[PDB]
Ligand binder design. Structure first.
Ligand code: LMT
Ligand code: CLR
Ligand code: 8PR
Ligand code: NAG
Ligand code: NAG
Ligand code: CL
Ligand code: NA
Lengths: 218, 214, 544
């Protein structure tokens, strides 16, 4: 149906510029205002501005005037937002959301765009299999894990066997220290399919465009 | 401009209880308030527009009320998947502003933390590092003590506690206590032990393993 | 012998309500409330009065005093003051023409609405008409509606595709042809001014009894009506909320000065003509004073008349009245206000008195507008003219119809703006400056205080003296410089005017101005003597 597919995460050095796209689909693109909402880590939603796709009618917020520049293209039904003078405060998630003209609600949003403004080098993650020992008592279920150590920025994805299954996967948030992140993942799966079948965790780092897959071994 | 104030940053409720989040605006708004539901890790989802009207695709358990400045979002039958952070937003005056955000935490019965200790893998011992892990899964509430024991002594340097958010299925928190050490220090000690003190029981749960090729 | 002494007015109240009739118009109704609520709200009253006291009032009273004292036209009075500036009298004659091309077409719209308002079901209520598109979405229809960028209201559809038919023109480039309905409306207008001007000051002065008093009645009905509407305090809040920070902007004062000037309209020759037909013994200080204070307060209450209905309209919609009051111009009264009064009981009544009120507002002002020019030409070419008044009056009226034929087009509205912004404002400001400087500096403000001292019996205060010598020509100079420095890009109905419009505008702004430096060249070029000799005999008026 109505889909707003935004662009991927961006790691940009402070002081530079960055442009974010927003592919709209599933409705008459010229029939709705295209908005941009900023969401800082742990903060509330922040309205950047809107744009009329017909003529590029940008209506900004006084707080973002000269900070963001909204553009639009009808030939591909895609709205863009460009940001200059990047600081540490801009390291936030940005959404592009559709809205009618009245009443002005935000019915459909995008998945978000993680922006990290830091001069820290893109560090690839170290994937180390967190496997149970060989002396443990195998009960009705075994808990497994995979450790992701030392990466930047927070763009990372830990999957388990192409997403099948994952009805008991506990993913622990990443922690930042000395400019590098570190997280861990776990999965509770019964003992009647291990170690008979194959269980493998896949760690993907989009900012460094790397993907290391490690299989758990007791 | 308009200042939307949500005085209560957190609200505790249970599955099936009647919950209601408040929203205070700067001036008179008539009936121009929209309520959004942002689930952890998802985009904000529109639920209510113009104070009381529900948006399409929203279950009957979500309602809205208020007329003037103060507005209220009501859920009659809270489900495990209704766990989210709710925002209120005005839609009359330029610019459009939002509320501070009210996280709805679900209250349930106590649960015993399942503690599992993990020895450093061979790929990490190969790299020259060794991290002993201690997972604490499915417990309630969030308040829980985690104590480390390298060889019986409470280890405190290099310990990181990571609490996940509440669950959307059984409403059970889960945390990870990580004890990261070097390889040289790992091959000079054997049986690692991590214990957890929770309110479910007075005696902390003690877990141990051996370094000598398990 | 023969004519000799000029005629005299029929009563004091006729000329009081007559100059009030010139002063009060459409702009008093909607322009001042918009510019007021936009520039700091109620705080705008603080500079507006200053720009009144120091700027509008002195020019108003000076013009009026000269008019009643010298009893001459706009062209013949310069013969007896400063002959080289006689071209001023000509300039106004051109300026007025440009104004009469668009000012009455607006009254034609209000007239087209008025005759279209006699039906039991008003046309701009439903969408099942012959002019509505598929975007037309209206009320008494399913609730929950969520407006779209392309959607359009039945009032906007009616004003756009019917009375204007502006969708049938692409802009200034292609605006033809002519809407015969507005041609018949404005023809009826030129008729109703024809039977109110053709005889002279007696008929204008008698029609003014109705054309200047009824707007207060209609404004009173819509005032007490708009006050009883639920949630009307929003428009009043947005209308009078003090935002003193906007007073720090050097623009706001400029807006206030331009407003009070173009709402008192001194130095246009209309006050000269209206003042000419009065008693020499008759006081005029009190006259000018009260008349202005009426135009200002009338504007003040008109603000409530508009923003109460706009407040109710912002209550039925969703507040922040500024959004429902974004567009200032013909759309604030013909669309928003009409759509607002559509949802009220006995809507035929309030509609009829509203658009009838619009015509009633324009009528008196245009009476006076023509009155000044007619007096000027009759006094400048006597005996060669005055053979009949209906001849010259008929000529100028049919001339105004042919002048409005460019405005009766589909894109006529476009032209209306081009003529409303570019042509009148700079030139009128200029001629008011040159006129004020010529009466205060050339003729000498001392001899003027002697003329008023012979007029009312007492010399005008040192306040009026310093206002005429310095404060007033600086008041006009302010708006002149601020205008020339930042001419405005203008847009109407989702259509930005071409970059070259200003060029066209400047032509229409200067094609009327060319007469005064060329007349100074004609005077100084026609009488031989030396430059110092001929300009000294050309600056001093007739001795006998
Ligand atoms: C304020 O000044 C006046 C109103 O007071 C207007 O500005 C004015 O400047 C131009 C300059 O040529 C005039 O020709 C015109 O009559 C008007 O548009 C604008 O609305 C705003 O700039
Ligand atoms: C009344 C008289 C004296 C004014 C004439 C001044 C001239 C130079 C001005 C007035 C109107 C102007 C034109 C208005 C219309 C257009 C059409 C556009 O596609 C090109 C610019 C062009 C061609 C302008 C050129 C300059 C212009 C011709
Ligand atoms: F440049 C300016 C001209 C006139 C004004 C006036 C100021 C006072 N209130 C009414 C304003 C409009 O007056 C009219 C109406 C119809 C006319 C007219 C004048 O001359 C020919 O046909 C202001 C500024
Ligand atoms: C209002 O409009 C939308 C159309 O976008 C419709 O789907 C919805 O069901 C309507 N009603 C409510 C109560 O939202
Ligand atoms: C509604 O208006 C838009 C432009 O405003 C136009 O493209 C569309 O064709 C219109 N609808 C109809 C049915 O004409
Ligand atoms: Cl005014
Ligand atoms: Na006026």
């Amino acid at each position: 149906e109505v889909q707003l597919q935004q662009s991927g995460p961006e790691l940009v050095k402070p002081g530079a510029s960055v442009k974010i796209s927003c592919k709209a689909s599933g409705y008459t693109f010229t029939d709705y205002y295209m908005n941009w909402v900023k969401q800082s880590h742990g903060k509330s939603l922040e309205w950047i501005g809107n744009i009329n796709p017909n003529n590029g009618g940008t209506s900004y917020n006084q707080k973002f005037k000269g900070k963001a520049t909204l553009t639009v293209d009808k030939s591909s039904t895609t709205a863009y937002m460009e940001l200059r003078s990047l600081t540490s405060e801009d390291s936030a998630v940005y959404y592009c959301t559709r809205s009618p003209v009245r009443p002005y609600y935000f019915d459909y949003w995008g998945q978000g765009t993680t922006l990290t403004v830091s001069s820290a080098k893109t560090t690839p993650p170290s994937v180390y299999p967190l496997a149970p020992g060989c002396g443990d008592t195998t009960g009705s279920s075994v808990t497994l894990g995979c450790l992701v150590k030392g990466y930047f920025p927070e763009s990372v994805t830990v999957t388990w066997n192409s997403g099948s299954l994952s009805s008991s996967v506990h993913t622990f948030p990443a922690l930042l220290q000395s400019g590098l992140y570190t997280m861990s993942s776990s999965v509770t799966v019964p003992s009647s399919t291990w170690p008979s079948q194959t269980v493998t965790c896949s760690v993907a780092h989009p900012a460094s465009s790397t993907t290391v897959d490690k299989k758990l071994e007791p | 401009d308009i200042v939307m104030t949500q005085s209560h940053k957190f609200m505790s409720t249970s599955v099936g209880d009647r919950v209601s989040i408040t929203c205070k605006a700067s001036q008179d708004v008539s009936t121009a308030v929209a309520w959004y539901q942002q689930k952890p890790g998802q985009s904000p989802k529109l639920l209510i527009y113009s104070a009381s009207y529900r948006y399409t695709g929203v279950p009957d358990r979500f309602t809205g009320s208020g007329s003037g400045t103060d507005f209220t979002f009501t859920i009659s039958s809270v489900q495990a998947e209704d766990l989210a952070v709710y925002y209120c937003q005005q839609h009359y005056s330029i610019p459009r502003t939002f509320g501070g955000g009210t996280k709805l935490e679900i209250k349930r019965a106590d649960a015993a933390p399942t503690v599992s200790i993990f020895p450093p893998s061979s790929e990490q011992l190969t790299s020259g590092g060794a991290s002993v892990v201690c997972f604490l899964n499915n417990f309630y509430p969030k308040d829980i003590n985690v104590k480390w024991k390298i060889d019986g002594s409470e280890r405190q340097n290099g310990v990181l506690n990571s609490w996940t958010d509440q669950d959307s299925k059984d409403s059970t928190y889960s945390m990870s206590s990580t004890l990261t050490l070097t390889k040289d220090e790992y091959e000079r000690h054997n049986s690692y032990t991590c214990e957890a003190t929770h309110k479910t029981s007075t005696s902390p749960i003690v877990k141990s393993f051996n370094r000598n090729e398990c | 012998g023969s004519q000799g002494e000029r005629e005299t007015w029929g009563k004091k109240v006729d000329f009081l309500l007559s100059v009030i009739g010139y002063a009060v118009d459409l702009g008093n109704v909607w322009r001042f409330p918009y510019i007021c609520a936009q520039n700091g709200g109620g705080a705008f009253l603080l500079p507006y009065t200053i720009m009144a006291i120091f700027g509008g009032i002195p020019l108003f009273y000076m013009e009026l005093a000269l008019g009643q004292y010298h009893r001459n036209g706009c062209i013949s009075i310069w013969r007896k003051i400063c002959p080289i500036f006689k071209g001023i009298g000509y300039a106004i004659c051109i300026i007025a023409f440009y104004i009469a091309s668009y000012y009455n077409t607006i009254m034609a719209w209000a007239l087209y609405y008025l005759i279209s308002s006699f039906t039991d079901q008003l046309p701009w209520t439903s969408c099942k008409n012959s002019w509505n598109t598929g975007n037309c979405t209206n009320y008494f229809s399913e609730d929950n509606i969520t407006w779209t960028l392309h959607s359009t209201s039945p009032a906007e559809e009616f004003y756009t595709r019917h009375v204007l038919q502006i969708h049938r023109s692409k802009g200034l480039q292609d605006l033809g042809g002519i809407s015969w309905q507005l041609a018949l409306c404005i023809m009826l207008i030129f008729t109703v001014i024809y039977f109110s001007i053709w005889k002279g000051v007696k008929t204008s002065g008698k029609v003014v009894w109705v054309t200047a008093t009824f707007p207060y009645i209609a404004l009173s009905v819509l005032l007490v009506r708009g006050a009883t509407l639920p949630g009307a305090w929003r428009g009043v809040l947005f209308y009078l909320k003090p935002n003193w920070q906007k007073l720090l902007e050097t623009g706001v004062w400029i807006d206030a000065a331009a407003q009070i000037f173009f709402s008192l309209g001194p130095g246009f020759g209309v006050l000269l003509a209206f003042a000419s037909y009065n008693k020499f013994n008759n006081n005029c200080y009190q006259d000018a004073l009260v008349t202005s204070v009426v135009n200002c307060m009338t504007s003040f209450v008109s603000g409530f008349v508009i923003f109460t209905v706009l407040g109710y309209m912002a209550e039925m919609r969703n507040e922040d009245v500024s959004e429902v009051a974004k567009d200032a111009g013909p759309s604030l009264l013909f669309i928003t206000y009409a759509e607002a009064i559509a949802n009220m009981p006995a809507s035929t009544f309030f509609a009829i008195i509203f658009f009838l009120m619009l015509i009633t507002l324009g009528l008196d002002s245009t009476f006076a507008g023509l009155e000044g020019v007619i007096t000027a030409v009759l006094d400048e070419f006597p005996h060669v003219w005055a053979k009949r008044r209906e001849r010259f009056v008929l000529a100028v009226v049919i001339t105004c119809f042919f002048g409005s034929l460019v405005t009766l087009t589909f894109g006529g509205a476009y032209v209306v703006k081009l003529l409303e912004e570019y042509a009148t404002g700079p030139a009128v400001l200029t001629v008011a400056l040159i006129e004020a400087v010529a009466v205060s500096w050339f003729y000498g403000i001392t001899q003027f205080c002697r003329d008023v001292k012979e007029m009312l019996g007492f010399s005008p205060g040192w306040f009026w003296r310093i206002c005429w010598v310095a404060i007033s020509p600086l008041f006009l100079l302010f708006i002149i410089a601020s205008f020339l420095m930042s001419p405005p890009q203008l847009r109407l109905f989702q259509y930005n005017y071409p970059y070259w419009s200003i060029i066209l505008g400047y032509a229409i702004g200067t094609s009327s101005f060319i007469c005064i430096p060329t007349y100074i060249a004609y005077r100084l070029i026609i009488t031989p003597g030396t430059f110092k000799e001929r300009i000294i005999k050309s600056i001093t008026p007739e001795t006998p």
